[PDB]
Design a protein around this ligand. Structure first.
Ligand SMILES: *[C@@H]1O[C@H](CO[C@@H]2O[C@@H](C)[C@@H](O)[C@@H](O)[C@@H]2O)[C@@H](O[C@@H]2O[C@H](CO)[C@@H](O[C@@H]3O[C@H](CO[C@H]4O[C@H](CO)[C@@H](O)[C@H](O)[C@@H]4O)[C@@H](O)[C@H](O[C@H]4O[C@H](CO)[C@@H](O)[C@H](O)[C@@H]4O)[C@@H]3O)[C@H](O)[C@H]2NC(C)=O)[C@H](O)[C@H]1NC(C)=O
Ligand SMILES: *[C@@H]1O[C@H](CO)[C@@H](O[C@@H]2O[C@H](CO)[C@@H](O[C@@H]3O[C@H](CO[C@H]4O[C@H](CO)[C@@H](O)[C@H](O)[C@@H]4O)[C@@H](O)[C@H](O[C@H]4O[C@H](CO)[C@@H](O)[C@H](O)[C@@H]4O)[C@@H]3O)[C@H](O)[C@H]2NC(C)=O)[C@H](O)[C@H]1NC(C)=O
Ligand SMILES: *[C@@H]1O[C@H](CO)[C@@H](O[C@@H]2O[C@H](CO)[C@@H](O[C@@H]3O[C@H](CO)[C@@H](O)[C@H](O[C@H]4O[C@H](CO)[C@@H](O)[C@H](O)[C@@H]4O)[C@@H]3O)[C@H](O)[C@H]2NC(C)=O)[C@H](O)[C@H]1NC(C)=O
Ligand SMILES: *[C@@H]1O[C@H](CO)[C@@H](O[C@@H]2O[C@H](CO)[C@@H](O)[C@H](O)[C@H]2NC(C)=O)[C@H](O)[C@H]1NC(C)=O
Ligand SMILES: *[C@@H]1O[C@H](CO)[C@@H](O[C@@H]2O[C@H](CO)[C@@H](O)[C@H](O)[C@H]2NC(C)=O)[C@H](O)[C@H]1NC(C)=O
Ligand SMILES: *[C@@H]1O[C@H](CO)[C@@H](O)[C@H](O)[C@H]1NC(C)=O
Lengths: 390, 391
């Protein structure tokens, strides 16, 4: 969606994975989804410098709305959990330098059941716009056919541009056309800032493995249409939670970087490890994901419970990922042909590789002939940045 | 196996999971299985107080032997990787206050391929005994039928006791009778200090889940025959490695404690996290696993992605585990009937519960009536210790 937005992958926070749809504010006020929750996370994003690092979007997922439209027919924030209403919330958020994102839905209901947006797109768009929203995650649950679907998506898209307000549009469009017919990604790109491809994500290594495995076994259709304006969105960064290990979390960050993926955390920034905050704010890595160019990386090598991913950056520089899929044993060692890496380019004839994950080290120079060897921790990853002597 | 050994679960170290069968001492030496490696690991077990915490057995798994028997017909440590034969190593190990454990095999070959022990049990036993071994992990790969198998196990058992040397006998016997007939566990208990049940283990949460789930859905046959002399062995503690998250590692330790399981680490005590060393050496937990009584815990409750496990200890005290199987979301909260927990016992009249994992806290006193409530992290666990009093 060429609306001059997301000219780099989007970076923010989304409550879904960490908080799902929690409403028992009686016995669980702190996990309970309420303007108080977001009101807090927002303060923090500024506090421990999340804004400073790159995350700027505070987005609300499903379960923020009240049972049904108002007299006028518009949507409404739950009376009890969102008394002051989005506008005022957006205001605060803005007051603190951030941008507010909201959840919607093309069908008759959100996946949560709350009101849909069928035959409301227009009304809704103006409402969000009016409210002062900055991003809309348009979910796709509940709708007859692709007819109603595909059109709902394209429609709402136009609606928004219409309102005049600059709103990042996150579609879940593809995810739903599967499995009925591969979607015409080029088209979808003309209506969305970024879209979902594979299912949702659990705070589990399995879930991450699968996402990579699927995205990998499909770069053909997706890896291409990626670029400024529209990106492929795997799903939130579940780093900071509990299901992942050290070598597992780095993998996710490292690889989300390689896939020029939207960086959306989903954890509790109130109680998050320092070791993890470190990773998530790693200037060097955020920098690779935020590469101005906008060329989505991809999987280069397979075999030997080893995966080699690479992404071309700006200025004859490339970023390479080394994932070790061997669930057991110790840290193995992989060695390849420096030459045949950056599509022949980077390292031709001078490369200056510097480990950037898990330890930001400074490896020497590498000639076209040179061979690169690095040990990789189980379920771990090694992120490198190659520079050409030019 | 009533040989006066393992009157409490065995605690030690086994290279398998962490080092598997590494032999390229040319381009991967630190992973390379050599007398050099163990020598180091042994020094450390004393250094960072692993001995002090409870681990006392330094055991060598498969791939320690040389291609084939010597002239005499005895086994022999690989010439290159184990120059000083074994014995001396045993001596260095014995020096550091530790005990040496070795890998063998009932069939014609070890799962690695190296020499077996078929029609050698006797010779081999005397050899190990002579070498100064303290524990034998008898693996069961390569053998015609249960005939050769079941007898190989029972035989070697006697052989060892014969040698006169006090040797812990770890059998992988059951793991092999399936697919044929559930093992006569009571019989196996008459020949082993502890045995393997379910398959091997990966540095993965999946692998741990499965072991628990398989074990859970089987306590009927195993949970019982467990006690001093013989225990059910799930497999090495993969804590300290990389496949497990924090909340995930506690689960493993907490639950190995509940299953009066042999505690055998399999990690590199050289580059191991402090946060992890802490857990593994937790005096309080090691204490529960090492409970003198010897009553294996079990799974008590199921449903709605929550598991409640409990184990009776000594002195009207029980240990309870709270696993949250929900792979996603945030930390949920579980609440139960204090009364209906320690089989009704613990908490009659009073109970003094103290969280011991993941944070060793001190919860107040609980009456039989009382209700206990605790939040649990995804794939995590909460280990509690209930004491019976009457304040
Ligand atoms: C370790 O490997 C050993 C070798 O086994 C494999 O197969 C052989 C053919 C080679 O290729 C070898 O390289 C392979 O590794 C294996 O040794 C074998 O042990 C079995 C069981 O003891 C023997 O089978 C029996 O053979 C007899 C014939 O002679 C035997 O009996 C006499 C009298 O007791 C002994 O003095 C001999 O040493 C032999 O042991 C058969 O009679 C009998 O079969 C029955 O059914 C047949 C077929 O219908 C009838 O013809 C017979 O009358 C019987 O009623 C058994 O099959 C086998 O001979 C022996 N092989 C060798 C080379 O010694 C050993 O068991 C393996 N150990 C483990 C744990 O796997
Ligand atoms: C409704 O839909 C219409 C149709 O798409 C939108 O119209 C677009 O409006 C945006 C608003 O900014 C226009 O964006 C501008 O595009 C220029 C074209 O450059 C592009 O291509 C070059 C060459 O490859 C790239 O180098 C460059 O990155 C762009 O991808 C840009 O040059 C403009 O520059 C921006 O960045 C520079 C540098 O920092 C700044 O100096 C500028 O101020 C600016 O921020 C800018 O991106 C776009 O051209 C319009 N498209 C069309 C087809 O007309 C409406 O915006 C939309 N309405 C709403 C409310 O969203
Ligand atoms: C080969 O097998 C034989 C028989 O299976 C085995 O002999 C057994 O040795 C154990 C080891 O002590 C005996 O069990 C003990 O029995 C005594 C009284 O019978 C108990 O008091 C023991 O517990 C207490 O006493 C111990 C001894 O000092 C203390 O260390 C401990 O703290 C307790 O206070 C324990 O139950 C068992 O009775 C014999 N069995 C027979 C039939 O004699 C022998 O050890 C094996 N040989 C080798 C070389 O392993
Ligand atoms: C996906 O949709 C796009 C948008 O229409 C298709 O590309 C257009 O194809 C028509 C031919 O009917 C051309 O006249 C347009 O110029 C094309 N648009 C662009 C932006 O190139 C595209 O062909 C569709 N993909 C598939 C596989 O059908
Ligand atoms: C498992 O093995 C045990 C013993 O090895 C069997 O129990 C024996 O049963 C006979 C029957 O009267 C008794 O006289 C013996 O005293 C028992 N032995 C022992 C050690 O208790 C048992 O039957 C076997 N189980 C099965 C299912 O076959
Ligand atoms: C919503 O439900 C109604 C009631 O059956 C149906 O007629 C309508 O087509 C549905 N809308 C979509 C987009 O599926």
């Amino acid at each position: 969606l060429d609306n001059g937005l997301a000219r780099t992958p989007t970076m923010g926070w989304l409550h879904w994975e960490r908080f799902m749809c929690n409403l028992d504010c009686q016995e669980e006020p702190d996990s309970c989804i309420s303007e108080k929750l977001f009101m807090e996370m927002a303060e923090l994003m500024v506090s421990e410098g999340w804004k400073d690092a790159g995350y700027e979007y505070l987005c609300i997922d499903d379960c923020w709305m009240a049972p049904q439209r108002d007299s006028e027919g518009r949507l409404q924030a739950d009376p009890q959990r969102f008394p002051h209403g989005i506008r005022q919330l957006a205001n605060y958020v803005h007051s603190k330098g951030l941008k507010l994102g909201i959840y919607a839905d093309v069908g008759n209901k959100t996946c949560a059941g709350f009101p849909g947006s069928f035959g409301y797109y227009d009304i809704d768009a103006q409402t969000f716009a009016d409210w002062g929203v900055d991003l809309l995650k348009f979910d796709g649950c509940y709708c007859d056919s692709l007819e109603n679907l595909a059109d709902g998506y394209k429609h709402m898209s136009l609606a928004l541009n219409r309102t005049g307000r600059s709103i990042v549009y996150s579609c879940e469009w593809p995810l739903y056309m599967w499995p009925f017919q591969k979607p015409n990604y080029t088209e979808i790109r003309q209506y969305c800032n970024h879209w979902r491809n594979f299912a949702d994500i659990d705070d589990s290594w399995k879930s991450i493995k699968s996402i990579l495995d699927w995205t990998s076994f499909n770069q053909e259709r997706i890896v291409d249409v990626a670029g400024p304006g529209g990106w492929n969105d795997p799903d939130m960064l579940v780093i900071g939670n509990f299901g992942l290990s050290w070598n597992q979390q780095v993998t996710q960050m490292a690889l989300w970087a390689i896939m020029a993926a939207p960086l959306f955390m989903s954890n509790d920034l109130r109680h998050i490890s320092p070791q993890a905050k470190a990773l998530l704010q790693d200037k060097d890595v955020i920098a690779i994901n935020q590469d101005p160019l906008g060329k989505q990386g991809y999987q280069l090598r397979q075999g030997d419970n080893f995966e080699v991913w690479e992404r071309p950056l700006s200025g004859l520089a490339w970023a390479v990922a080394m994932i070790n899929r061997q669930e057991i044993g110790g840290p193995r060692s992989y060695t390849i042909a420096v030459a045949s890496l950056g599509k022949g380019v980077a390292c031709n004839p001078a490369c200056f590789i510097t480990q950037l994950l898990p330890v930001k080290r400074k490896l020497g120079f590498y000639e076209w002939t040179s061979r690169l060897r690095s040990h990789i921790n189980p379920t771990g990853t090694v992120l490198l940045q190659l520079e050409n002597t030019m």
